[PDB]
Design a protein around this nucleic acid. Structure first.
Ligand SMILES: Nc1ccn([C@H]2CC[C@@H](COP(=O)(O)OP(=O)(O)OP(=O)(O)O)O2)c(=O)n1
Ligand SMILES: [Mg+2]
Ligand SMILES: [Mn+2]
Ligand SMILES: [Mn+2]
Ligand SMILES: [Mn+2]
Ligand SMILES: [Mn+2]
Ligand SMILES: [Mn+2]
Ligand SMILES: [Mn+2]
Length: 542
DNA sequence: GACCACGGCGCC
DNA sequence: GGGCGCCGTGGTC
């Protein structure tokens, strides 16, 4: 039999599938080691990869977005196009890696660019075939995921400005506060130990100081030293508050204050995350290297850190955040008339819960009190126990149970939608979003109750979180070209929030426009309301 | 140096 | 409660 794949000289014809090898996975930081392309039955290998990038009109193939990011870094406008990872991810969002997708759908992810190109081509063919007749998944691919990949490449290449000297100064200040706390912890324990070691702390708290253990850890069943356990022990011994404070500051310093300034890119002078498009079971994006979707916001030090994310000189940040997003989406999905009415009347369920929680009038609820109510409202919605709710609010168990009962009694059709969702997931093997994005949940049939019930909580959540994800993605695709036209920049997505950068002279017009695009994206049974703020830094913009 | 699993915890 | 990614530790190679 004749050979299946022939080598031919660079450059490839238009429409070819690319393969490429990076020195490291992060495209803003990677050296392009090899580039190749495949089409029909030929493979073309680039003599010198960087120069050869200039020969391509489009990056089509596995991880197309990442090659596009690298090209943009080098000042080339090479947009991403088809990518089999996106097809695979829509078929089953457990398809998250090229290694796994290759094995499942047609071969092997190797370390050679030509092989990667040929792999890209055959995977695309095979996965296109698998989507035959999947009209809703195809619509998601063509209208959302494929165009979104080009938006994400542009965002990644743009980056965000960081106040490096501010964070360097903050490190020195927090180091002194950490030393005070750790020293006090050791004074109170009677000796030093590694306070970063939860194993060493466990022995200190429960074996040496004789404090009561409250909870156990999941995989190894050690006595937990989690914040929930420490909070329960706060009045038992003065060491506990000191450990909580030490943990707060060390978490911020080790995760954000110290690492972020070291990640400023030498070419751009900015901070560049990865927006991972095939990483979550629900259709959300993720952000990594560094994660810019978990920048602190709740504590005073945390807020200091958020102040380091700044606009370029002469620009402003614009932050837009969907109000009460998953409660609105749930209203639509469930058709609950009471929940629909809440939003028709302009009510805020987080503010109402905060009022009850803190025992103050709604007018007296401040933003951090309202924020605290989110874990309560979403926790309860998605199945939090009365035991946990009682601990979290320091109320009697019976009062926590009453809250839970009243919450679902208020929105009677939510329970009906839960049962419909679970039956469908049992029968089909998967649950789905409004747009038809699917998540397979085989443990809905598990015979171990704890395993099955966990699966049920995963399954009930997915259509709500995932529909919210679908809406935000669609909004990004519609908004991006509007911003390009106005000389504004899309910088960050944070699940139901976008952070943009706009010249000062155009910032108010950009904010107004972006708000309207987001609110009007895909109308539901309730209004989608967007909160918008403008500022020189991310804290000020919210 | 690197890997991972884990506990833990930051955000949505 | 659900969804993530990164930290340091500990064990390991
Ligand atoms: N503890 C949380 C916080 C958030 N989310 C999910 C549901 C809401 C969504 C977006 O987060 P927020 O913007 O913080 O929530 P919101 O209800 O949209 O609040 P806001 O009106 O302040 O934007 O992420 C969740 O499941 N659990
Ligand atoms: Mg938000
Ligand atoms: Mn590799
Ligand atoms: Mn400024
Ligand atoms: Mn929101
Ligand atoms: Mn459906
Ligand atoms: Mn741009
Ligand atoms: Mn984990």
């Amino acid at each position: 039999s004749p050979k299946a794949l022939e080598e031919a000289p660079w450059p490839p014809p238009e429409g070819a599938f690319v393969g490429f090898v990076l020195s490291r996975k992060e495209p803003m930081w990677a050296d392009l080691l090899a580039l190749a392309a495949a089409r029909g039955g030929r493979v073309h290998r680039a003599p010198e990869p960087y120069k050869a990038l200039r020969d391509l009109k489009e990056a089509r193939g596995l991880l197309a977005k990442d090659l596009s990011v690298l090209a943009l870094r080098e000042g080339l406008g090479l947009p991403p196009g088809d990518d089999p990872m996106l097809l695979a991810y829509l078929l089953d969002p457990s398809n998250t890696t090229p290694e796994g997708v290759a094995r499942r759908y047609g071969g092997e992810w190797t370390e050679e660019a030509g092989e990667r190109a040929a792999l890209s081509e055959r995977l695309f063919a095979n996965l296109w075939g698998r989507l035959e007749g999947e009209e809703r998944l195809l619509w998601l691919y063509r209208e959302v995921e494929r165009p979104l990949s080009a938006v994400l490449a542009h965002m990644e290449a743009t980056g965000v400005r960081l106040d490096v000297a501010y964070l360097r100064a903050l490190s020195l200040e927090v180091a002194e506060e950490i030393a005070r706390l750790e020293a006090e912890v050791f004074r109170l324990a009677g000796h030093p130990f590694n306070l970063n070691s939860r194993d060493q702390l466990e022995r200190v708290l429960f074996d040496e100081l004789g404090l009561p253990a409250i909870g156990k850890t999941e995989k190894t069943g050690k006595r937990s030293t989690s914040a929930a356990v420490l909070e329960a022990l706060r009045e038992a011994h003065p060491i506990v508050e000191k450990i909580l404070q030490y943990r707060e500051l060390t978490k911020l310093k080790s995760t954000y204050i110290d690492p972020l300034p070291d990640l400023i890119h030498p070419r751009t002078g900015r901070l560049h995350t990865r927006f991972n498009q095939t990483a979550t079971a629900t259709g959300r994006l993720s952000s990594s290297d560094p994660n810019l979707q978990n920048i602190p916001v709740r504590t005073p030090l945390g807020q200091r850190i958020r102040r380091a994310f700044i606009a370029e000189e002469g620009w402003l940040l614009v932050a837009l955040d969907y109000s009460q997003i998953e409660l609105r989406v749930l209203a639509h999905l469930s058709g609950d008339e009471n929940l629909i009415r809440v939003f028709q009347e302009g009510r805020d369920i987080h503010t109402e819960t905060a009022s009850w929680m803190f025992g103050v009038p709604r007018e007296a609820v401040d933003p951090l009190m309202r924020r605290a109510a989110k874990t309560i409202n979403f926790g309860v919605l998605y199945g939090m126990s009365a035991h946990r709710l009682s601990q979290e609010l320091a109320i009697p168990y019976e009062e926590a149970q009453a809250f839970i009962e009243r919450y679902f009694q208020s929105f009677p059709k939510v329970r009906a939608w839960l049962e419909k969702t679970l039956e469908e997931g049992r029968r089909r093997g998967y649950v789905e979003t409004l747009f038809g994005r699917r998540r397979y949940v085989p443990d809905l049939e598990a015979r171990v109750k704890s395993v099955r019930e966990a699966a049920e909580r995963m399954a009930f959540n997915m259509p709500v979180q995932g529909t919210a994800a679908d809406l935000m993605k669609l909004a990004m695709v519609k908004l991006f070209p509007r911003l390009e036209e106005m000389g504004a920049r899309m910088l960050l997505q944070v699940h139901d929030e976008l952070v943009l950068e706009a010249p000062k002279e155009r910032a108010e017009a950009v904010a107004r426009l972006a708000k309207e695009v987001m609110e009007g994206v895909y109308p539901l049974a309730v209004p989608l309301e967007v909160e918008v703020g403008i500022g020189e830094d991310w804290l000020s913009a919210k």
